[PDB]
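README, section 4: Worked example with a bound small molecule

Sections 1 through 3 covered apo chains. Here we extend the same pipeline to holo records, where the ligand is supplied as SMILES alongside the sequence. The molecule in this example is N-acetyl-serine. Nothing else about the input changes; the structure line simply encodes the ligand pose together with the chain.
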Amino acid sequence: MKLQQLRYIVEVVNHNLNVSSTAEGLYTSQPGISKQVRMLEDELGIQIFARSGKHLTQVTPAGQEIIRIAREVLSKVDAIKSVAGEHTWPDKGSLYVATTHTQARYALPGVIKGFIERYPRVSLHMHQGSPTQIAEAVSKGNADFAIATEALHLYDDLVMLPCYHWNRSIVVTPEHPLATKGSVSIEELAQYPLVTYTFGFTGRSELDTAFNRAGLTPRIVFTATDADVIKTYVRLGLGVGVIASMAVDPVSDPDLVKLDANGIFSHSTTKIGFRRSTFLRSYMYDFIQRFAPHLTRDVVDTAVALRSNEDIEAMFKDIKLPE
Amino acid sequence: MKLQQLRYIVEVVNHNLNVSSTAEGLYTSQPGISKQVRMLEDELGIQIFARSGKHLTQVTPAGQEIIRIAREVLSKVDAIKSVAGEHTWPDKGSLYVATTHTQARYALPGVIKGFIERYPRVSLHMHQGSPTQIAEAVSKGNADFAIATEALHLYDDLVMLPCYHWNRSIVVTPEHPLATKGSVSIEELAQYPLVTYTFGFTGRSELDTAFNRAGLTPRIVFTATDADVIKTYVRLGLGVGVIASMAVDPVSDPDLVKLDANGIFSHSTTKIGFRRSTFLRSYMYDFIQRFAPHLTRDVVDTAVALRSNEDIEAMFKDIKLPEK
Amino acid sequence: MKLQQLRYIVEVVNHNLNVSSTAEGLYTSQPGISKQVRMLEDELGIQIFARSGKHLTQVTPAGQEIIRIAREVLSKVDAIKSVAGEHTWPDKGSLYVATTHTQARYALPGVIKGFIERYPRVSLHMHQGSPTQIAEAVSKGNADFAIATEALHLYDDLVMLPCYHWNRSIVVTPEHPLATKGSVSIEELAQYPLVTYTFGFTGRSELDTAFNRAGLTPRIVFTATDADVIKTYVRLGLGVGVIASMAVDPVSDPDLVKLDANGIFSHSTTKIGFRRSTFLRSYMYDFIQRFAPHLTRDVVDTAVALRSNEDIEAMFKDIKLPEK
Amino acid sequence: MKLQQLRYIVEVVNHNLNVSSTAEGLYTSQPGISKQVRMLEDELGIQIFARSGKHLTQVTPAGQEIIRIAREVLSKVDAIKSVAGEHTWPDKGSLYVATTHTQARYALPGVIKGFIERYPRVSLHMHQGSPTQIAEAVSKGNADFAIATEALHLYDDLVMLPCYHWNRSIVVTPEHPLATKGSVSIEELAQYPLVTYTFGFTGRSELDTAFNRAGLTPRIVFTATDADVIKTYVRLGLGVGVIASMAVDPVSDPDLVKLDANGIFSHSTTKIGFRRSTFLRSYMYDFIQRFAPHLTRDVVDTAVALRSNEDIEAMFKDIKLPE
Ligand SMILES: CC(=O)N[C@@H](CO)C(=O)O
Ligand SMILES: CC(=O)N[C@@H](CO)C(=O)O
Ligand SMILES: CC(=O)N[C@@H](CO)C(=O)O
Ligand SMILES: CC(=O)N[C@@H](CO)C(=O)O
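The generated complex, written as structure tokens:
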């Protein structure tokens, strides 16, 4: 059978079985129509229309099922012509970044907003994880980039690109013995129960270093992997939170008290990282310099071309990285 | 657009993008098909296939949508001719079923005999195969029904009707250690070389689940599609078969012991099923009911109007189906 | 054989066969560990690891068995110390839970507050992650409990206790086409770019099933592990989010509309679970009951004595769990 | 803690809390035992044994749980020493053959019985399928060999190794108008309803050829992919079966009647096939010559070395292949 026959029998019913009126609507002749209809009935060996004279009188019981399915065939062919084009698919590439939650929510949404404007057909996949985990996916071949924010010793066999420096705040409820006070100390911090990151104390971290040096041992009551849970947890009593300062601002967090701890702990450096055997696509270079605006193609190319991350550190020695 | 163009592109996929093979298949020539393909591409404004040189390498994203719809169009066309058949002469036509060797050999022979006796002018065609091939046969228009025994996620796009639940046996030669000793644990079973289906272990079968639960890995020496090959292999040494309990006959299977493996592996469910676009002729409703007594005509049509195989399951929630 | 040797080989696997990384991790030196490893190999008469030059390339079949057992041995050792803790001072210790961002942010804060109030000398450690990482944390001894929201086949080796059923929402900016129009079909949804979890589409999730049923393929522009990232992304243009309905607040989520996607995707089930080898301290039973009221102590111990998570399910068959 | 401590406390309970008797059984001294026990209790900070004098009096409530788990630790360590060796695993290789059911049940069980004796650590995987399917897996990379028994036009881009020739029988029930008769004909075959293979009639097959040439059209009532179902189906009435002669023998099939059809249809040739880009392992060469004993390594090497299957056909031109 042909699509055309199907069109003709549906149309003959739209026009109330008037074949002459069918012809005018379809820009053809009554013999044209009638030839196709009769050919279809011959092919199928069943009458789709009852006739009395030359005249169509009605659709036969069987014809009614054929016309119903025929209407479905037509509708589907339209649907074929409606199938959207190759530019609706994001198959121009895929970028897999392993990073932190604060980085993805307070840092990168400003970058993501850009990368997607430029590359609307590259798909973007932000995996989160402990410093340990972040570093493992890059090695394993599961991730393109690694945005290490600390414990950068784990990101060992990877290019290391300094992006900025960050500082740990102390967070407390408004009513807390620290909420009204000006500056606070290491000794009188360790006095309180501590709420911080799950990987915060490992035996080599900075939080640790500041307690081992002071011969103090802190009382940890709650840890989480994500800062937003540390903060939600501090909607309670006596605990003291120890997270990134960028994880708290008084606009979103008016129910909390952000409080300098800049002179209490050493500072950290969020680097970006990736395997050396990875062809840097355009969208890759793009993400890097969207995150850190000084990591322009040339800087990166100049950076990777070297032999050791010591040499990149050497390279940025006397340049004030952002804060 | 033309039906022939939709046939051609569907057949190209059916033939694994091998256009020389397609052309032999439809008794025309490669240039005939390519011209038709390219015109469709031109007409739609969409490449259906990625290309290399003279080779087709893959169906594109957009091509995939177009092709899916093309498959529906052609199945509708075959429904038109089936409706005419039904009205012209109800007791005359053909039924194609795709299933496994065990279903054919042990669940169907009776059912078939009955049917052929009632419908001597209906030709019946039984394809045997793996879950993947059963799904394939229904997809390429080679089969009206699937009778599927496991891996039911391969049939989410079909209407599938529950038939019965079944369980597996461990089966060995009478010498074998497990014969003499009582019941068998997964830890015990894991220490021997396993004989089972090619789709026995897939990463997500009932056999996988039992082994993942115990944190064990199976030692697989021999697989086959057909439970009957597997059964001949066990005529030797240490190998332990893992197959359906109904593939073994306490009478006509005299050289094999049949150990209770109901407590190692969970049961599977056998379903019979079709594309929603298949016109259900009277002999087809009969075939379903003869295979599965509780699938009366109203039960079927009731089941077809629902949205999901999960909704169909719900229909049968306050019933207990046969165990086999 | 020595405990230290079993620690070492387990840690080598935990560290992805990276022995330099292992050695840094346990504050000793690579030669220390290699010597211990090789001696174990020598003692057992089995290479645990395949090697290349100075590199470990994979764990061998036999090595895999040995390692699985080694993991049990070490968990038993930690059970000994947990029992001593329980008897010496019940209200003092640590609880480690691994779960998703939404569980932490929206199902736990209350539950936690209650617990910390009753047990001020129990430190609580909440790891957030993907189904794969939740399973990983319990396997490497980093977590006492998993609260798993989907992909439950990743936990066949744990005792898992049903908590509640949950469903997903389609979520968009108020401009978006779908806002204005009524209910949404999968065919409609498939025509937009999707925003969902990194484990949203796996080949066997609830999202896959809905799409396979309709014969459609999703256009995935953005994934993230955390429902909250996904929610910030939808502050833009066309992208349509597919996430849990409880990750969205008709109050504190004011820039997003929440479309009924209960009729596109089937529900999932949130379970809480542990290795059978974990000694259940009193505060742990409390944590379970506080999270899931119907998991009383007897219900738990009743559930642990059963053989399967499927048997556990059966316990709850004549009950209807909470929907969230 | 150490395994040794665990051993000591379990053993002290096996010996009914007599430490001196424990020492003799373990070839050590009472101070030896007692040092480890006390060290464990110190590590755990809980008493495993109640004491009255120097004497053990009983296992404490907590000690009873520790000794129970300790017994489980010991048992597991034994289980480690019981883990079977690398020679219990079939990881020396895997062979994926795509063939027919008759071939796998009446032909290859004699070969399989051999291959497994020689290679007990190569796993063997027999996939079955329509001639079409058999040929597709080889191409796709899912199979190592293809044992085509007919429609060898599908096995196009593959090495083709003739193994033997086979002939189609006719099968019927004892009571059938053909059961007592001697020889039968093409015309009076087409008189009956036909039970044969699902791919039997394609438009190029031999069954076809013999009917197109004779200007006859047969009445097909039942097809199956497997011969055993064709035969089981012929436990009925009037149908006539058309399958391989090797698929029927009067020992297994006494309820049937096998009946020459050698002069009614052309003969077929079961070849073995494989991609040219496939390194023939030892177990591969082995299977080929176990199936066809004349396809010895040298024959195969001599066979593949050529350029066209026409040349292999040329090569076997005047050699009587088996039957
Ligand atoms: C800047 C940042 O994201 N810091 C981490 C801490 O490593 C965080 O998740 O807060
Ligand atoms: C009951 C049944 O047919 N089972 C399949 C395997 O799922 C078989 O072929 O034996
Ligand atoms: C209800 C829930 O927690 N769902 C997961 C996804 O399965 C989430 O993180 O949102
Ligand atoms: C020899 C053989 O196996 N022949 C096929 C027919 O192609 C069969 O399955 O009987």
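What to look for in the output: Residues 184 and 261 of chain A are 7 Å apart (CA to CA). The two ends of chain A are 73 Å apart (CA to CA).

Section 5 describes how to batch many such records.
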